[PDB]
């Protein structure tokens, strides 16, 4: 067996999703930078595996893939017998029950939380003005999603059931930025069940590893 | 039979229906009249906690989110209908899945904003953001520029066979071409135009278009 290849910077939320999945699945990997300032995202050989010139990309001995969620589904299937065996289920019913929340994250939680972090953390870093109109509508949307999560997480320990799965994992990247790079952490802590869930999943050793990697590179 | 909740005119509902037709799975449509707030009934929220459509029920499970429903159907009924719709092995499945994600992350948001602003907003006449329109038309054009390159090297997005990757584009694509003045986004592009001709010509999709009529 050979370490898989992950293309992109660990600071990327989509890259981070792949990295924490590989750690949870106990899969060795190498991270290969894709530096836009060196035109690396536009190289023909990169575009063959990532047609959008975005990150992450993935390669192993069998295939090249793009989009973080499809990379992670592939990884979870290929290495099903390894690491966290239930991460994306152990049968088609479990997989689907997990997947619906993965889709919910990509369609609702992700876009609203993403925009919030953008304005609140990164505009000030660049010393440019925020769009309060952007702040507001996405806080409402995210509020509604989190009210739904609060109810679900009072009836179930994790989103898809009684154990940590990809459903929860997939919330880590945007959730981390929201809680640790903005002052909107209270959206989680003010909600008793969501707060517990966030503390539980963000304290996993896999996720903690990803956090460190952002400092070294 | 399996139950699909919601109106055929919905893009997310349509995604599930055309998949069921491609997979030769019989189904029953259970209406959800959102104009009557039926999507917020306590019993419906039990199977669709976001109060959205579609929802899906069969003998073993209840699911929400159209793409998750469709992945479930394609696996459960892998030996029915179009057997290659989501691949016949793990490599084929992933190669299709990456373009399904491209649709949901890149094509979907912008084409979806345009479908709303131009095809849905005039009914219940809402002032259109010109604005949200301008931005998303440019975003969609960029995505279709990528598709134009890809579809010059491949008959369909994931390979030379029609798959769920292509299918997932039908709902938003059809409203743009047939219910807005933005059809040129697909026809101004040579390879995307051919691709659109092929996927929109499938009998499964044409059935969905008809099911909207006989509501």
UniProtKB/TrEMBL annotation, chain B:
- Listed Pfam families: GST_C, GST_N
| Recorded GO CC terms | cytoplasm; cytosol
Instruction: Spell out the family assignment given in the record's similarity comment.
Output: Belongs to the GST superfamily. Phi family.
- Record-linked CDD domains: GST_C_Phi, GST_N_Phi
Q: Does the keyword Transferase apply?
A: yes
The record's EC number reads 2.5.1.18
| SUPFAM superfamilies, per the entry | GST C-terminal domain-like, Thioredoxin-like
Stretches assigned to the GST C-terminal domain: 89-215
Provide the catalytic activity annotation.
RX + glutathione = an S-substituted glutathione + a halide anion + H(+)
Q: Which parts of the sequence belong to the GST N-terminal domain?
A: 1-81
**Localization, UniProt:** Cytoplasm, Cytosol
Where is it chiefly localized?
A: cytoplasm
Which InterPro entries has this protein been placed in?
A: Glutathione-S-Trfase_C-like (IPR010987), Glutathione-S-Trfase_C_sf (IPR036282), Glutathione_S-Trfase (IPR040079), Glutathione_S-Trfase_N (IPR004045), GST_C (IPR004046), GST_Phi_C (IPR034347), Thioredoxin-like_sf (IPR036249)
Q: Can you say what this protein is called?
A: glutathione transferase
Q: Which Gene3D superfamilies match?
A: 1.20.1050.10, Glutaredoxin
Organism source for this protein? Populus trichocarpa (Western balsam poplar)
Is the keyword Transferase assigned to this protein? Answer: yes
Its keywords, alphabetically, are: Cytoplasm, Detoxification, Transferase
One term of GO molecular function: glutathione binding
BP-aspect Gene Ontology terms: glutathione metabolic process; toxin catabolic process
């Amino acid at each position: 067996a050979t370490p898989v290849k992950v293309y992109g910077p660990p600071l990327s939320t989509a890259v981070s999703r792949v990295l924490v999945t590989l750690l949870e699945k106990d899969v060795p990997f190498q991270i290969i930078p894709v530096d836009m300032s060196k035109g690396e995202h536009k190289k023909p050989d990169y575009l063959k595996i990532q047609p959008f010139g975005q990150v992450p990309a993935f390669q192993d001995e069998s295939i090249s893939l793009f989009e973080s969620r499809s990379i992670c589904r592939y990884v979870c299937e290929k290495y099903a017998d390894r690491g966290d065996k239930g991460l994306y289920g152990t049968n088609p019913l479990e997989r689907a029950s997990i997947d619906q929340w993965v889709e919910a994250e990509g369609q609702s939680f992700g876009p609203s939380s993403g925009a919030l972090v953008f304005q609140l953390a990164f505009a000030p870093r660049m010393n440019i003005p925020q769009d309060q109109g952007v702040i507001k509508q996405n806080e409402e949307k995210l509020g509604k999603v989190l009210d739904i999560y609060e109810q679900r997480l009072g009836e179930s320990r994790f989103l898809a059931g009684d154990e940590f799965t990809f459903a929860d994992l997939s919330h880590l990247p945007n959730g981390d930025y929201l809680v640790n790079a903005t002052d909107k952490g209270h959206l989680f802590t003010s909600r008793e069940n969501v707060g517990r869930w966030w503390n539980e999943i963000s304290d996993r050793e896999s996720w903690k590893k990803v956090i460190e990697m952002r400092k070294s590179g």
